[PDB]
Design a protein around this ligand. Structure first.
Ligand code: GLC
Length: 392
């Protein structure tokens, strides 16, 4: 009796998953659970290893996968995933999750994964005590951000923005783009109505370039946790990162939300929640099909999601989640989830296929070397053209 769970929740990202695994082992003491993590922020490495396994005919029993185009445009269109519609009916999930989320996991009459959470991409983290020590406010626009960072450089803070490795630069970029375009034109990139070479979209890269000039010069070789650490250490003022950062700061670092650190929407994005969702499906050919199905039932449940997510920093996908189980960050994100305009993340798989996502890092590499907005814009457009962005 075995169950192999594939994810990128390694190291200090593992607490929430480990909690779910203990829960599963209580309910199913016969099953030896293989925690098959591929170490690497945002699943860049996991994606590559999964590809080797899936194409090799050796699927895991289930794998972490983002709801939306990431899920659909890779293993679903390849006809390698089981349709979960029957299970959704059995569990009452169609009424348990918001319709917008159901839509992301639905394609050609089937439902293809089970959401465990909602993360938000567009969060700016800072230490409200360090900001007072520097006598600045948390910036609500990119102009105020750029002006505040200049003040901080003047006051001796060399790199007021914390930044890490390539994907985290893309992560920053999607917040900047959302701010510059607004939610509708952000959405228009992904349906192909707005070209990346439109002056409106080129400007995303202009604003992004200036933001990049407030960042640490050693960013390329740092993990997302190391970039958060810079803020906690006061070697930076700000970091734009998903709310797994809140999980890191509370679960791992034992910091108190609101007093030891605070949060705001990414500058220029207040009122918009850029979402993503970690989900699990059922691969065809899974060696342990029933055990995996039982894992899906747990991750789709209120008991599972309200055990795991408070540790993670994400909120539950389930509408019936109990807010009393969440700290001050969790409860804030819960509120914004219900009230804000919702758009999806690029970097975390909601809005574009892996064909595009995987090549966006190359685009970002070339912006880092050229710092030419038009070149980057042109590169994103060529990629979109080559993959047929919008066809799914
Ligand atoms: O690795 C950092 C984060 O990246 C991913 O995009 C996941 O959706 C999230 O679960 C994870 O914490």
């Amino acid at each position: 009796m075995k169950l192999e769970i594939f994810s990128w929740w390694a190291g200090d990202e593992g607490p929430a998953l480990e909690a779910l695994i203990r829960l599963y082992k209580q309910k199913y003491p016969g099953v030896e659970v293989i925690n098959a993590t591929v170490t690497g922020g945002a699943g860049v490495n996991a994606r590559a290893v999964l590809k080797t396994r899936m194409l090799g005919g050796d699927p895991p029993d289930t794998f972490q996968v983002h709801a939306g185009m990431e899920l659909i445009g890779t293993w679903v269109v390849a006809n390698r995933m089981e349709d979960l519609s029957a299970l959704f009916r059995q569990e009452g999930w169609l009424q348990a999750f918001p319709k917008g989320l159901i839509d992301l996991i639905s394609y050609k009459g089937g439902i293809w994964s089970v959401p465990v959470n909602i993360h938000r991409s567009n969060v700016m983290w800072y230490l409200p005590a360090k900001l007072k020590g520097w006598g600045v406010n948390p910036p609500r626009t990119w102009d105020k951000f750029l002006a505040t960072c200049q003040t901080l450089k003047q006051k001796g803070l060399e790199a007021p923005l914390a930044l890490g490795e390539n994907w985290t630069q893309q992560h920053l970029w999607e917040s900047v783009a959302l701010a510059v375009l607004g939610p509708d034109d952000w959405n228009n990139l992904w349906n192909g109505k707005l070209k990346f070479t439109d002056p409106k979209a080129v400007r995303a890269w202009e604003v992004f370039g200036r933001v990049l000039d407030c960042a640490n010069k050693d960013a390329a070789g740092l993990s997302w946790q190391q970039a958060v650490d810079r803020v906690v250490q006061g070697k930076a003022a700000f970091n734009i990162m998903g709310d797994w950062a809140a999980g890191y700061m509370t679960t791992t670092l034992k910091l108190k939300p609101g007093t030891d650190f605070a949060w705001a929407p990414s500058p220029g994005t207040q009122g918009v929640f850029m979402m993503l969702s970690d989900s699990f499906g059922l691969p065809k050919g899974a060696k342990n099909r029933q055990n995996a199905i039982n894992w899906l039932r747990l991750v789709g449940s209120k008991e599972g999601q309200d055990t795991s997510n408070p540790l993670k920093g994400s909120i539950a996908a389930r509408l019936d989640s109990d807010p009393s189980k969440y700290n001050a960050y969790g409860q804030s994100a819960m509120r914004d989830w219900r009230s804000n305009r919702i758009v999806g993340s690029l970097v975390h798989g909601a809005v574009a296929p892996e064909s595009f996502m995987s090549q966006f890092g190359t685009v970002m590499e070339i912006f880092l070397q050229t710092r030419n907005p038009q070149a980057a814009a042109n590169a994103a457009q060529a990629i979109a053209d080559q993959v047929g962005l919008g066809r799914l």
